[PDB]
Design an enzyme around this catalytic site. Structure first.
Site, PDB file in Angstrom:
ATOM      1  N   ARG A 293     -16.516   3.382 -10.759  1.00  0.00           N
ATOM      2  CA  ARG A 293     -15.479   2.805 -11.777  1.00  0.00           C
ATOM      3  C   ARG A 293     -14.816   1.898 -10.310  1.00  0.00           C
ATOM      4  O   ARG A 293     -13.471   1.598 -10.740  1.00  0.00           O
ATOM      5  CB  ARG A 293     -14.522   3.637 -12.311  1.00  0.00           C
TER       6      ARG A 293
ATOM      7  N   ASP B  56      -1.158   4.875 -12.431  1.00  0.00           N
ATOM      8  CA  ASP B  56      -1.374   4.375 -10.971  1.00  0.00           C
ATOM      9  C   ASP B  56      -1.990   3.034 -11.253  1.00  0.00           C
ATOM     10  O   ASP B  56      -3.033   2.605 -11.564  1.00  0.00           O
ATOM     11  CB  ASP B  56      -2.081   5.204  -9.996  1.00  0.00           C
ATOM     12  CG  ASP B  56      -2.310   4.597  -8.746  1.00  0.00           C
ATOM     13  OD1 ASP B  56      -1.757   3.425  -8.334  1.00  0.00           O
ATOM     14  OD2 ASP B  56      -2.568   5.244  -7.566  1.00  0.00           O
TER      15      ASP B  56
ATOM     16  N   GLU C 156       0.910  -1.254   0.155  1.00  0.00           N
ATOM     17  CA  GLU C 156      -0.062  -0.012   0.075  1.00  0.00           C
ATOM     18  C   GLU C 156       1.007   1.134  -0.109  1.00  0.00           C
ATOM     19  O   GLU C 156       0.643   2.040  -0.647  1.00  0.00           O
ATOM     20  CB  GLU C 156      -0.953   0.127   1.188  1.00  0.00           C
TER      21      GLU C 156
ATOM     22  N   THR D 126      -0.652   8.183  -1.034  1.00  0.00           N
ATOM     23  CA  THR D 126      -0.026   9.606  -0.530  1.00  0.00           C
ATOM     24  C   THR D 126       0.325  10.306  -1.497  1.00  0.00           C
ATOM     25  O   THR D 126       0.229  11.543  -1.508  1.00  0.00           O
ATOM     26  CB  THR D 126       0.826   9.428   0.575  1.00  0.00           C
ATOM     27  OG1 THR D 126       0.241   8.673   1.881  1.00  0.00           O
ATOM     28  CG2 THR D 126       1.450  10.748   1.019  1.00  0.00           C
TER      29      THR D 126
ATOM     30  N   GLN E 159      -3.815  -4.155 -11.312  1.00  0.00           N
ATOM     31  CA  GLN E 159      -3.326  -5.348 -12.097  1.00  0.00           C
ATOM     32  C   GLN E 159      -2.657  -6.353 -11.271  1.00  0.00           C
ATOM     33  O   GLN E 159      -1.631  -6.564 -11.141  1.00  0.00           O
ATOM     34  CB  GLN E 159      -2.244  -4.760 -13.299  1.00  0.00           C
ATOM     35  CG  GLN E 159      -2.969  -3.874 -14.168  1.00  0.00           C
ATOM     36  CD  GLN E 159      -3.996  -4.051 -15.225  1.00  0.00           C
ATOM     37  OE1 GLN E 159      -4.056  -5.376 -15.168  1.00  0.00           O
ATOM     38  NE2 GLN E 159      -4.820  -3.473 -15.575  1.00  0.00           N
TER      39      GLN E 159
END
Ligand SMILES: NCCc1ccc(O)c(O)c1
Lengths: 272, 344, 58, 339
Positions: B169, B191, B38, B43, B195
């Site tokens: 979305r 970003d 993450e 950020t 995937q």
């Protein structure tokens, strides 16, 4: 009758410059604006070595131009046109590098890239034609077997437009590019990255120094020899003229042997 | 022939539009955002994005077509579940909606007849029951919202949005493109968070990216998840960094490395300072030396003479993020241009 | 017990495939050749088409 | 307990399948074809060059009229070309430029594309306006789309990087059938001539034969060691071929349940990106990472010829329904028509 000792100069000028042309024409990695300007330079050098230098040799062998007057007018015109084109190609290369650093977003593109190359190459050959054109009629004032440029109306004009303006262009631009590279070097501040900047601060000096030394003594003499009575024997004038072509022999190495992609292309061409 | 000349005129119009679009599209900067968790990805994205009406203004016809397709789905629910309308005439209206969807006309201008029939359908208790039984037949609840407001969607002809969800979305997942400008440069940040698939297959599509932004967390030096099988975040971050750094498609692509959560790191290193991930580390038990060692661990993964890694330490409350990327991009572009000339 | 459900699905898939009938390889190869031979004269990449007939050469 | 019994049963079933395979694998195409003449040397040349893309081309597909070619590239523009004149017919902007697959409907009415956004977009090419717009978006995948192929105007088969394939109802915009059983990302699809069966290739290198109407995997084939990147059917529908990152192409027969032939060469160290067959099935074409496409004699396991006009990796191949022309596309942004 010892003019034939200049044969190797012709052989060297053509050889190095054909490698440059082939390095681009046989490769796709070398498809940049700088490579296109370098090829244009190589072409100007190939044309001076092929179209002008054999007649420089013929004239040195026999000091009497035992040939037609038209042939000489053509020879003289091509001599000026090709030397001017080589110098102007050096200017185009310097300004393209300036754009590359001063305005990095305009350099790294495809549409403005093609437009800038087209304009710079066209203007180089247009100016070289325009400058040498007056030598095709009238002003040459050749007399018997002597057909040497010595008309102040053309000599001063040509010297200023073909060299002194192009001369002052590259040195300030190259120095400015250095000022930019130096001021960024002093802020970015692992040894190799500074060293890579150092190679740039050395390679720029090489490009400028060889240009200055090869063409400067000719044009000063070129004007001085007509301006006033002075100690300029024909051997000094001819030696500087030859130095002017030596510059054409030098260009392929300083422009292409520092680029790894050119080195690889040359090794492929040379089976090395 | 005249027919061939007409074909040539169409072809020329296509070529002209493609060239003009290529001309504008090329004037940009592409950045790929990667990380091994993450991390600081969310950020750094929030910080970089200091367009807001762009998607809202552009998706009206999408919300509209979702509203109609969903209403047809509701009609299917009506017949599948056995929920009848109070007014049997509305079944004919329900058929019209399905035909609009089956004819692929749900993106077409909305007529008065379509509004009248769909409003009649929406007010029936059986449509609300179809949603009440949405657990048996799957219905779109966002479309339900738009159907409650359908009178506005229709009568107004055009309205950017009725919801701030931005279509959500949520299922789109996939690649999230963030567009922004700073000073004189435009940027597109990819970003690639959704995937959850093999990177070898999709990485090549970013081969021409201007730069890679890689985010790791300093606080991960001793953070081990159960999913990590005793390995900490710092080692997963370094292994991914090394994998991307030496990828055959990114040999000459520069990396902008962000070391996030510097505050949590500085506080945490009071206990067990960098011993947990780098047991071999020797040095002062300080913020500056632990950070220098970690950065060196990332720097050592650059094995290409034509690549460099930019490093900056960040904090969620540290807003100096856009200038760092801007400057790194400027230096990357300059270095690439200098290699074009061969100066350097 | 997710690995058990997965093993069950694998076992059922293998049991299904294990009962599929099969023919000899030499027969399949002979049929493949028969197809290729029967239409060989019709294939523009094996029998070049003259420019008066070939729409890309005309 | 139960897990170990099921694992042992699975191993026993795999062993039984392998032995059932040996019962038939007592011959090979590479020996039976010693009785036929070779195709000889094939020297194809380009007849048309199609220019217009400004980015790597990832997908291409021929229509059923052998005239209209569709392609897609990283530019985010799906372009329909007239292969005989080089005239462009359509250019469709995409909502997402990360496109990896495209297809052309057999009727000429629809096109499709998709990629890293996990959405399959269906476009209507026959409109009253004369413009092309999105007719449908097929959402529900949880990974990238590797291949889209139409069965009919109202049905499309998709495959994604979510270890699954699906049969979609275009008019409704929902999945009607899903195909599961893969473990790795699925790279490619190919449809049978009769539309009833299809195959898929997977990163796990187990290609599968799927029953479109049943919704299950009917046959599993193995043979490759690395990921399978391209798959196609033999024109008669009883055989298929795969290409992989092992620089190997393999031909399999669905009724034999066997691998019939292996295509490899000592000088090929690049993987396969596309595979196709000629109308007669005699020629096998494959695109490679060394910027060329090899033409193989499908019955000989040898090289018939080489197409080598590209400056970058070949990304797509196709053959017209009548066999008249072969199209290629690569990462250099150009398309070529070979004859
Ligand atoms: N022969 C050296 C080339 C040359 C000769 C005369 C000139 O005026 C000039 O500009 C250049």
């Amino acid at each position: 009758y010892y003019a034939t000792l200049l044969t190797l100069l012709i052989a060297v000028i053509v050889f190095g410059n054909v490698l440059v042309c082939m390095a681009v024409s046989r490769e796709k990695a070398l498809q940049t604006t700088t490579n296109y300007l370098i090829v244009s330079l190589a072409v100007a050098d190939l044309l001076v070595a092929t179209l002008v230098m054999p007649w420089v040799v013929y004239l040195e062998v026999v000091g009497e131009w035992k040939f037609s007057r038209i042939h000489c007018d053509i020879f003289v015109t091509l001599d000026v046109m090709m030397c001017t084109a080589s110098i102007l190609n050096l200017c185009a290369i310097s300004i393209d590098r300036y754009t590359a650093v001063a305005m990095p977003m305009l350099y790294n593109t495809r549409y403005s890239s093609k437009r800038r190359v087209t304009v710079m190459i066209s203007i180089v050959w247009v100016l070289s034609f325009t400058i040498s054109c007056p030598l095709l009629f009238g002003l040459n004032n050749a007399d018997q077997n002597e057909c040497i440029i010595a008309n102040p109306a053309f000599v001063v004009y040509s010297s200023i437009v073909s060299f002194y303006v192009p001369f002052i262009v590259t040195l300030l631009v190259y120095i400015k590019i250095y000022i930019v590279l130096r001021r960024r070097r002093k802020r970015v501040n692992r040894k190799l990255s500074q060293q890579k900047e150092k190679k740039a601060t050395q390679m720029l000096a090489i490009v400028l120094g060889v240009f200055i030394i090869c063409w400067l003594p000719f044009f000063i003499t070129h004007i001085l020899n007509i301006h006033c009575d002075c100690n300029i024997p024909p051997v000094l004038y001819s030696a500087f003229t030859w130095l002017g072509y030596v510059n054409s022999a030098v260009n392929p190495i300083i422009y292409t042997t520092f680029n790894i992609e050119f080195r690889k292309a040359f090794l492929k061409i040379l089976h090395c | 022939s005249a027919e061939e000349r007409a074909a040539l005129e169409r072809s020329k119009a296509i070529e002209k539009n493609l060239k003009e679009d290529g001309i504008s599209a090329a004037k940009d900067v592409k950045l790929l955002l990667l990380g091994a968790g993450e991390s600081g990805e969310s950020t750094i994205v929030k910080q970089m994005k200091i367009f807001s009406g762009e998607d809202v203004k552009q998706y009206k016809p999408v919300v509209y077509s979702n509203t109609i397709q969903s209403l047809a789905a509701i009609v299917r629910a009506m017949d599948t579940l056995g929920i009848e309308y109070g007014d049997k005439e509305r079944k004919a209206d329900a058929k019209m909606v399905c035909d609009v969807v089956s004819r692929m006309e749900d993106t077409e201008p909305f007529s008065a007849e379509l509004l009248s029939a769909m409003m009649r359908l929406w007010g029936d208790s059986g449509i609300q029951e179809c949603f009440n039984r949405s657990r048996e037949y799957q219905l779109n609840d966002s479309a339900k919202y738009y159907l409650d407001s359908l009178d506005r969607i229709g009568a107004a002809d055009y309205q950017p949005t009725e919801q701030d969800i931005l279509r959500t979305r949520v299922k789109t997942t996939g690649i999230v493109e963030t567009h922004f400008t700073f000073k004189n440069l435009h940027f597109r940040l990819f970003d690639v968070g959704g995937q959850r698939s093999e990177r070898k297959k999709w990485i090549h599509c970013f081969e021409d990216v201007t730069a890679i932004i890689f985010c790791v967390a300093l606080s991960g030096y001793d953070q081990v998840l159960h999913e990590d099988e005793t390995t900490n975040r710092m080692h997963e971050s370094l292994m991914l960094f090394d994998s991307i750094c030496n990828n055959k498609f990114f040999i000459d692509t520069s990396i902008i490395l962000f070391l996030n959560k510097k505050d949590l790191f500085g506080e945490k290193i009071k206990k067990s300072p960098l011993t947990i991930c780098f047991p071999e580390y020797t040095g002062p038990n300080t913020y500056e030396d632990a950070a220098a060692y970690i950065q060196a661990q990332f720097e050592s993964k650059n094995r290409s003479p034509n690549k460099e890694i930019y490093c900056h330490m960040t904090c969620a409350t540290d807003t100096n993020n856009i200038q760092v990327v801007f400057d790194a991009v400027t230096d990357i572009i300059i270095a690439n241009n200098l290699r074009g000339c061969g100066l350097y | 017990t997710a690995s058990i459900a997965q093993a069950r699905k694998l076992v059922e898939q293998l049991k299904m495939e294990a009962n599929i009938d099969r023919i000899k390889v030499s027969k399949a190869a002979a049929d493949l050749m028969a197809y290729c031979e029967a239409h060989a004269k019709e294939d523009p990449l094996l029998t070049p088409v003259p420019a008066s007939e070939n729409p890309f050469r005309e | 307990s139960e897990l170990d019994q099921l694992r042992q049963e699975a191993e026993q079933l795999k062993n039984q399948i392998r032995d059932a395979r040996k019962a038939c694998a007592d011959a090979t195409l590479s020996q039976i074809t010693n009785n036929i003449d070779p195709v000889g040397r094939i020297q194809m040349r380009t007849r048309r060059t199609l220019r217009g893309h400004l980015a790597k081309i990832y997908a291409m597909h021929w229509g059923t009229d052998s005239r209209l070619l569709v392609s897609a590239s990283q530019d985010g523009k799906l372009i329909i070309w007239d292969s005989y004149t080089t005239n462009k017919v359509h250019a469709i902007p995409l909502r997402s430029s990360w496109v990896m697959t495209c297809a052309y409907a057999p009727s000429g009415n629809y096109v499709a594309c998709g990629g890293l956004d996990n959405i399959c977009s269906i476009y209507n090419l026959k409109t009253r306006e004369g413009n092309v717009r999105v007719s449908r978006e097929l959402a529900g995948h949880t990974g990238y789309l590797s291949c889209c192929r139409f069965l009919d105007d109202n049905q499309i088969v998709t495959s994604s990087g979510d270890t699954t394939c699906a049969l979609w109802d275009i008019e409704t915009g929902q999945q009607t059938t899903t195909f599961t059983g893969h473990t790795g990302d699925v790279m490619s699809l190919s449809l049978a001539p009769d539309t009833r069966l299809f195959v898929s290739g997977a990163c796990d290198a187990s290609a599968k034969l799927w029953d479109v109407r049943e919704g299950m995997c009917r046959q599993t084939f193995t043979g490759h060691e690395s990921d399978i990147n391209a798959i196609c059917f033999f024109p008669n529908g009883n055989a298929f071929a795969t290409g992989s990152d092992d620089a190997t192409c393999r031909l399999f027969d669905l009724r034999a349940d066997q691998e019939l032939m292996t295509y490899s060469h000592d000088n090929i160290i690049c993987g396969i990106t596309s595979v196709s067959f000629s109308k007669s099935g005699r020629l096998l074409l494959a695109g490679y990472d060394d910027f060329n496409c090899n033409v193989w004699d499908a019955l000989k396991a040898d090289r018939a010829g080489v197409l080598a006009g590209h400056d970058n990796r070949v990304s797509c191949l196709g053959v017209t329904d009548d066999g008249m022309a072969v199209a290629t596309g690569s990462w250099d942004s150009f398309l070529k028509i070979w004859n």
